[PDB]
Structure formats: structure tokens, C-alpha cells
Paper text:
PEAK pseudokinases are molecular scaffolds which dimerize to regulate cell migration, morphology, and proliferation, as well as cancer progression. The pseudopodium-enriched atypical kinase (PEAK) family of pseudokinases, also known as New Kinase Family 3 (NKF3), is composed of three members: PEAK1 (also known as Sugen kinase [SgK] 269), PEAK2 (also known as Pragmin or SgK223), and [name] (also known as chromosome 19 Open Reading Frame 35 [[name]]). Crystal structures of truncated PEAK1 and PEAK2 lacking the unstructured N-terminal domains revealed that these pseudokinase domain-flanking helices fold into an “XL”-shaped helical bundle and facilitate dimerization by forming an “XX”-shaped high-affinity dimerization interface termed the Split HElical Dimerization (SHED) domain. 14-3-3s are ubiquitous regulatory proteins that act as dimeric scaffolds to modulate their client proteins through a wide array of mechanisms, such as altering protein-protein interactions, inducing conformational changes, regulating subcellular localization, and sterically blocking access to phosphorylation sites.
Strikingly, full-length human [name] purifies from mammalian cells as a homodimer in complex with an endogenous 14-3-3 heterodimer, and we have obtained a 3.1 Å structure of this complex. The addition of 0.1% n-Octyl-β-D-glucoside to the sample prior to plunge freezing alleviated preferred orientation, and selective processing of the [name]/14-3-3 complex particles in CryoSPARC yielded a 3.1 Å structure of the [name] homodimer bound to a 14-3-3 heterodimer. In the structure, the [name] homodimer is docked to one side of the 14-3-3 dimer cradle, with only one monomer of [name] forming an extensive interface with one of the 14-3-3 monomers, yielding a buried surface area (BSA) of ~1453 Å2. Based on the cryo-EM map, we were able to unambiguously identify this 14-3-3 monomer as the ε isoform, while the distal 14-3-3 monomer was most consistent with the β isoform. Although the disordered N-terminal domain of [name] is largely unresolved in our structure (residues 1–127), the cryo-EM map does contain robust density for the 14-3-3 primary interaction motif (residues 66–71), with clear density for the phosphate group of Ser 69. The Ser 69 phosphate group forms contacts with the positively charged groove of 14-3-3, including the canonical Arg (ε-57/β-58), Arg (ε-130/β-129), Tyr (ε-131/β-130) triad as well as a Lys (ε-50/β-51) within the αE helix. The secondary interaction between [name] and 14-3-3 in our model is quite unusual, because it is located outside of the 14-3-3 cradle. Residues Gln 144 and Arg 147 of the αN1 helix within the SHED domain of [name] form a hydrogen bond and a salt bridge with Asp 200 and Asp 201 belonging to the 14-3-3ε αH helix, respectively. Several residues within the pseudokinase domain of [name] also make polar contacts with 14-3-3ε.
Numbering used by the authors:
A (entry chain C): 3 to 232
B (entry chain D): 3 to 233
C (entry chain A): 128 to 406, 419 to 473
D (entry chain B): 130 to 406, 415 to 472
E (entry chain P): 66 to 72
F (entry chain E): 66 to 73
Write the structure that this text describes.
Amino acid sequence: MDKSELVQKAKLAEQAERYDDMAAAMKAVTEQGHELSNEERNLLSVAYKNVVGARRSSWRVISSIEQKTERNEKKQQMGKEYREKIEAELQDICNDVLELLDKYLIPNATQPESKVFYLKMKGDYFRYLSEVASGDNKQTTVSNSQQAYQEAFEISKKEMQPTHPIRLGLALNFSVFYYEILNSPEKACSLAKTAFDEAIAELDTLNEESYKDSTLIMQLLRDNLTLWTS
Amino acid sequence: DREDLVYQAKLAEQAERYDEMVESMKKVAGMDVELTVEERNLLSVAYKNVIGARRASWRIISSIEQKEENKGGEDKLKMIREYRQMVETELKLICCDILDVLDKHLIPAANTGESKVFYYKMKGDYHRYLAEFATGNDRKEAAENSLVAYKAASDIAMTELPPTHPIRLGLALNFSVFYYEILNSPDRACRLAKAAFDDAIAELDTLSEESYKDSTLIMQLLRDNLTLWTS
Amino acid sequence: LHSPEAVHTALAARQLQGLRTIYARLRARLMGGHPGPCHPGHSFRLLDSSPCAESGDALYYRVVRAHEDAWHILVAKVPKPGADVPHPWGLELQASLSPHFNLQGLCGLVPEGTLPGAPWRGAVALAAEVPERTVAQWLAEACTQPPEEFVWAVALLLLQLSAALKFLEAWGAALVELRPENLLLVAPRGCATTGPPRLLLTDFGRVCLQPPGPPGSPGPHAPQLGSLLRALLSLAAPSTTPLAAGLELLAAQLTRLRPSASRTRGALQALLWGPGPELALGPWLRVRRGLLVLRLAERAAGGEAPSLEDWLCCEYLAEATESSMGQALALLWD
Amino acid sequence: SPEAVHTALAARQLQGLRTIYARLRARLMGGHPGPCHPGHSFRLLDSSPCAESGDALYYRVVRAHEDAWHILVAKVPKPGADVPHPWGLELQASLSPHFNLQGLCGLVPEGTLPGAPWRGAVALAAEVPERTVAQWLAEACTQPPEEFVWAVALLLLQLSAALKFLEAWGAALVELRPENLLLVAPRGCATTGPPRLLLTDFGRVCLQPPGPPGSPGPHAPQLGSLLRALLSLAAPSTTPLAAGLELLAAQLTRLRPSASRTRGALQALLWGPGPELPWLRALGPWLRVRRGLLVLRLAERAAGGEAPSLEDWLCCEYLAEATESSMGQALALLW
Amino acid sequence: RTQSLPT
Amino acid sequence: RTQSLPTR
């Protein structure tokens, strides 16, 4: 099937709210070895974040039930197996996306904003694996997540405007990794403060078209700082 | 098995994994034993979320097709039509699954007048969801089989359930909607909804508060549909 | 006002809400006084040392059930010795169902040894209603009437039977045989004894599971009804009477087309009160609904109570539609 | 055609109301004793007043003839009572039976019941008394319900039918007072609902020969005074009927309308049209609707086992003989 | 716009 | 409670 028909099926599966179909279409676009345009990057990202978000939500509910059912053994042995069923789907989808990023997207990407976008994705999917992994596999996964975010940050600090929506997007998610995965709330506070202060100082240089996005992300960076400080 | 298959259905409900809730409850339904009120509710909730998600996508894809039919390209419409027909195939497989469970296992096994009215309503509804998207002969056959099932529920309900009972009110709500939408007789739809609402009004004074609040919710759905169809 | 279509519409809607209220008030008096199920607090005593009635399957003796200075009359349904019971699933059905006008309800059971010196041994069911006669005994008396009164009474009994069989077809069950000696006649509650009797179906020992099948399938009772109907009419003195000739057409159509009990009930109502062969069914139904309400008001002023026949007519016209009446006319004149 | 359909239904429903009115009248006017004859015999049931009224005392008496049996009431003149028009006591024996008039069936002479409290011959009435209107007001003024206005309007509707019959005859009542007016239960229809009202005071009725209107009803000032007495004894205005009766009471003393016109205004306040209805044009379609609703009301009560009340019979007499011309006059006197 | 029974 | 970058 031709590339324009795969992209049109992805835009149709999005509106119909069938995200498992949308991800299969955008995987098939990605495997052709062409570099993606801005609409195609957004369709790939929206597809997989909806496919993973369902599993993250279900795993939190069933993992909570296994903490609450402290009394009864013949129930606990069912709760455990059902968590481990969900936990294996979550690990499969993250390894599906990390294969696209390693084999196709990052080795073709030859522009700063494009590399920062994919290195943020590589950071995020190792982060989602670290939410559910345990033992030496957690330590291995946490290292790979930090390596991806820092390489995005050494680019984004140098090649991009301090106000740019994806420089804000990277500073937001890299601060969440320090707060929730490395349990270092001081690093999370000072990073989020630094990025918010850098962005605020230069909004006078920014057109309304970009400012709409920058201010909407900057509010979330202030919300996290307010929660963590309170 | 039975008490653990119900627990797997309660886990899959809270995880929002309704396709696994369906397999858990379909195993319970296949035992040929009278289901409790809890197990009847789990069985309905499972299929109703699984079919409901597909119905919503089918209406959106159909709506998009009607906007593109304003002289859009025939290749783009051919793609939209192939995608819509794929979603219709899933609706056929979900309906024919529950209708076979109802016919073989649940309807023949049912001991009570409440149980038989509930299962003939499910058979009426799952035949009605096939009549939403089918055309020609297969819309006629779906409309006939749905009509027969709601009549059989009604003929039993008049003996077995009070006119204020939530199942007897719910039957009149779904069966009047079937006349307005599927057969398209707005007069019969109004007449049936008004008669069922009038029969309830006479008896609310006899109820407990926790009964009254449950019956009156379905009566308010009858008022709303009557208010709409009167225009 | 000053818009005749609005005047005609508002009165037609209010006359129907009137008929549905009349039907419910009369039903509540006919169905009233049903005893609740037996309890550990209740106690029993025997009025009859020989039966108040005999059915083809059972002997009935009156039993008084009393508790805390409230009491009821019930009948001990003693099975006749040596009788067959083809389907024990139908006996489990009889004890499951809620109260219906034309089906025998059971109030429970008298356990072994309770009534000393009783006409029976072991435990026996108690039925709610007290019977007069079987239909087989009623025919041996009533077929001596002038034929235009006999045929009206027969048509009202077949109307009540078709409603009891309609319920069983909706439930998914069937009678393997229809026998007049197993159909009972009861005096309707609060209504003058010279009216029509209330009919009970009682042979649940012959009720069995019948999977309903596809919508094109034959009805399970139509060959039995078409053979019962002609056996009853064979007793009548021949006349050209429109109802007598109409029932002999319905008998031929039953055994040929094999319709359901609900399509059969619609043809019996059409022979009794419905559109003639000459039928415009909308204006006709509105005129008849208005003439029935006048009959009920003019007699109430006289001081007469509504009869069972008037309640059965109120039931037909309150549910009739130009669809149902067209199907009834099509079955009969075909 | 809806024309021939609603033409035929309107004609058949009016024949229905005429039949309902005649069947209820025949039960409410049933059991009336026929005239005395020299073969008759009597027994006294009671030793003290079976009723008391402003000018008469009442005692209940068995009558027997050829093994037929009746109960009647001897009307003893109260000590100190007087008769302004003795011709009116002849009129009481001369008139036909009427639902709202105290009729007489014959006489009991002295020595027939020598153990009774009276002496001399005493006339006997056909009805058995309960209470006077003044005695019913003595109850009602102590515990006056919010529905007292409705009960009063129905008593005045019945009184206006009696005074209409006198104005249609050659006569009028000279003085009107509630201490003589008597109440009895409706035969075969009795409940907490309205009593039958009897006009009693034939000692105060006289001839009325004028052809021209004069004051168009000789009773009309007296009804105005009686209605204002009843309204001033009642609680304040809490229902539109109370305001309507206050507007009627002024019109009665202002225009002095005939008792037959006064009756129509009371029927219009109870069941008829009002200013909320142009008012002279809608009356035809309004009757076809209003008649249909009464036939339905009667049938639902029959389905419920409730026999028709005296209120339902008075409503049935109004809607049978109602017309667009009579309703236009009733509306003109009210507004 | 028309409503069937919710769950 | 804590926010990560939203889905659009």
C-alpha cells in the first residue's frame, strides 16, 4: 500500500478513536526509511502514547489491588498473575517503539529539533519500562533513560531557543525522571526552576503562535514545582 | 471455578479490560445454571462496553464519509468505505457471540420471571444493534427478530413484574426507542412510552426511598424521549 | 379550541387513558384476595370429607388456613391414583410462576401427618382458587341452550384459553394435549354468578419445554386448538349465525396455517367485537371505544356492576391498533 | 369523514346523559309513600323530637295497609309558631312531588296515636328529616373546612331550583330563613357528600300574578342577603369560587334577576365556563369536550365500585339541558 | 439524541 | 498528581 494511504488511514483511525489501528499504520509508514515530517512525527507520537497509556493505567489499578488484598492467599495468587499479564503487554509496546527509534528514526535524523524529539521519546519509553521493572533490570533501564535525556539536553541547551515548546517539553519530562524514578527531588526542583526562569526572561522575543504552546507547557512546570515545594 | 471466574471478571472490570471480562463471564454463562443478580449484571456490563466502543467509532466513520461524499475523491471514499466495513465486521462478531450464548445456554435454563424478562431484553437489544448498520434483506430479518424478542419480554413482564420495576421500565424505554429508530413509527414509540410512564405514576407512593430513586431515574428518561419525539 | 383536529385528538387520547384506567381498576378487584405462600406460623383444618370438585387428574377438598385471626379457603389438590404424569418439569413450572388470571397458582403444601383422618396420605399441594366444574361437565349441561347463546359462551371460553397458551408460548413451553376434563371453571371475584365463568388451565403435568425456533416456524398449539374448537361446535344445533360460521372458518385456518396463540387471540376478539368482513379502521376504533365507555356509565347509573365480558372487551379495545386488526381480518378472511 | 363521525358521537353522547339523569332521578326519587286511605293503620316509633326546626317539631311514624309498610313523619306545629299565608299550607298539599320541596302524604287524626305528645290532627311528610341548614351551619362554623364554600354553593344551587319551581308556578316565598330549611340523606347514594335540601316553609308563600318583570325575581334580594350571611360566616377568600360568589351577591341586589337566571350563574361558578375561556363563540366545542369528560368520570368510578354522588347527578342535569344561549346569559350576569 | 438505558 | 507532557 502507498505511503499517502497509510497516513490517511492513521488520520481516520485517530478520529474514530481506534489507537491500536493508528499505531500499526504509523509503524508501517516509519519502516519505509524516509525521514518523517512534523505531521507524521505527531501521528506516530500520539498513536503510541495512547497505546501505552491504557496499560500504565490498568497496571496501577491491579498493582494497587495486590497491595490492598493483604488478608487472603488464594486471592493474592490470582492478583499477581493478572498484574504480570498486563506488565508483559506494557514491556512489549515499549520495546516495539524503542526498536523504531534505534533502527530507523534516530540514525536517519540529521537536524537538532528532530534529534531532540526522538531522544526525548527514547528517554520516555525507558522511563515507562522503569515504572514496572525490578532488580538489576530496573538499574539497567534507569541508566538507559538518563543517557537518552542528557544527550537531548546537551543538544537542546545549545541548538534551540530557550522558549521553544520542545525545549520546555524536554525540561518538564527530565525533571519528572529525577523526582519519581531517581527519587532526587532537589535535582527536579533546580532543573524545573532553571528551565522556567530561562523561558520567562525571553517571552518578549516570542510570537503569539509559539507563545500559546510555550505558556501552556510552562504552567505545568510551575504546577510540578508547586506540588513538590508544598 | 464459578466463584473465581466471577473474581477474574471483577478484576478485568476495574482494569477496564472488557474483552477479558467477556471471556471470564462467557465461561460462567456456559454452565447451564441460574445466574445470580450480580452475575447477570457482570455479563451485561461486559458485552455492553465491548459493543459500545465499536458503535461509537462506526457513527464517527459514517459521519466522515457523508462529509467526504460532497464531491470528494472516489479513491479517498473507497479507503473510508473499506475502513467502515472492517468496523461493521467486528459488530457482527460481537453480536453473534452473545446471541448464541443467550439462545443455547441462558434463555432455556432460566427459572424465574425476572430472569426471562432480562434475557429476552438482551436478545432484543443485540438483534437491534445489527439493524442499525445492516441494509436490504438483513435489516428486515434483524428488525423482525428484535420485535419478536421485545414482545416475548413484554408478555411475561405483565404477569411477573410491577409496573414501577426497573426491568419493566427499562424494557418499555428500549422497545419504544426500537419503534422510533429501527421501524420508524414515531406514533407507536410515543404511545408505548406514554403508557408505561402513566402505569408507573399510579404506584410510586407504595415504594421505599431506595426503590423510588431507582424507578424514577428510568421514568425521567421516558419523559425526555417523549419531550423530544413530540416536537 | 377553534381547531377541530385538536379537539378530536385530545378526546381520543383521554378516552384511551380512561379505558386503561377502567381495565386496571376491574383487574385489581378480579385479582384481589389471592392468599400469600404458606408459613411455619399457619395452621390447617378440613371442611370436606368428599371432594368439592373432581378433575380428570385430581380431587379437590376445601382446607381452611388460619393465622392470628386472619384466614383463607384453599383446596388440597390430591392426585387421582393410577394417573400418568408425562412431564414433571411442568409441575416445577407451576410452582415458579406469579399469579395469572387463567393459570392455576399454588400457595404451598400440607406436609405428611398434619390433618388426622384425612382422605389422602403423604404431602399435597394447596391451590389458591376453589373450582365449580370442569369444562367437560359444563358442556353436558350448556349444550341444551339455544345455539346463539351456547356459541357465545364457547367463544368466550376459547378467548380465555388462548391467553393462557399465549403466556406459555412466550415463556417457551407447550401442552402436549388439550383435554376439557382438565380445564376448570371458577366464579369471578366480586361479580354476579350468572355472568361468564373464569377459566383455569391446570394440567401442568403435560407442559414441556418447547424451544421457540425461527420467526417463520409453526405455532405449537394450533392443531390442538383447531381440534378442540370443532369438538365444541359439534354439540351446537346448526344455525346460519355469523359467529358460528366465523368460528368454523377460524377452525379451518388454525389447522391449515398453524398461527401462534397471539394471532389466534386476535381473530377471536375480531369475531366477538371487531371489524366485520366489510372493513377506515382508525375512525372505527375511536367510535367503538366511545360506545363502550357509554355502556359502562349508563349501567353504573342503573346500579349494575361491570361483568367479566365487559372487562374482556375493555382489554381488546384498549390494546387494538390498525395493524393488529388488519392482521386479524387477514387471518380470518384470507 | 370526521364531520359525520363527531356529529354522530355528539348526538349519541347527549342521549347517554339524558338516560343517566333519568336512571339516577328514578333512584333518588324512589321509595316515596303514596296517599293515605281509610284501610290504613299506624304505630309511633319514638317519644321525643326526631327533628326540630324554627316553626315545626317532627315525630316518626309507621304506616301499614294490606300488609304494605312505610315510614313517614308527623309535622307538629312548634308552640308559638304562626302562619302569615294559610293559602300556602293549601299549596303544599296541591303541588306535585319535587326533589327539593317538603311534600305531604296525608293526615293523622287524634286517637289514632293517643300515646303521642300531640293532640288534634297532624299532617305527615314523605321524607325523614336529619337537621336544619342553621344546625349544619352550627357544626360548620365550629370546624369550617377550606371546602365549606363548595358545600354552601351546592346547597344554594338546590335552593334556587326550589325557588325556580315557585316562580314557574303562580307563587313566591315571602321570607327566607335557614332555621326552617331541612337536610336529608340521598336515597341509595349516601356518603360524606352533599345532602338533599328540602324547602319547608309553606306557611310564608303567596300568589304572584304580574306578567311584566317588576323586580325580575321576587326572591333575588333575599338570596343576596342569605348568600352574604353565608359568605360573612365563612372564612376569607382562598379559592376563586369565593370571589365569584361575592361578585354574584352584589349583582343579585343590583339587578334582582329571576331565580331561573340565578340558578344558571351558580351552575357556571361550579362547572360552567368563565372569563378564562371570544367567550360567546367557543361554547359549542366546549360543551362537546365537557360532556365527554363527565361520561368518562362516571365510568372510572364504576370500575372503582363507587356509586354516583348527588354532586354527580346535579352536574349531569346542568350539562344535559345546557345551551349556548343559556350559558351566555349566565356569563353576562356573573361578568 | 434519543436515549436507551445506561450501565 | 505530578504532570508529564500531555498527549497532543
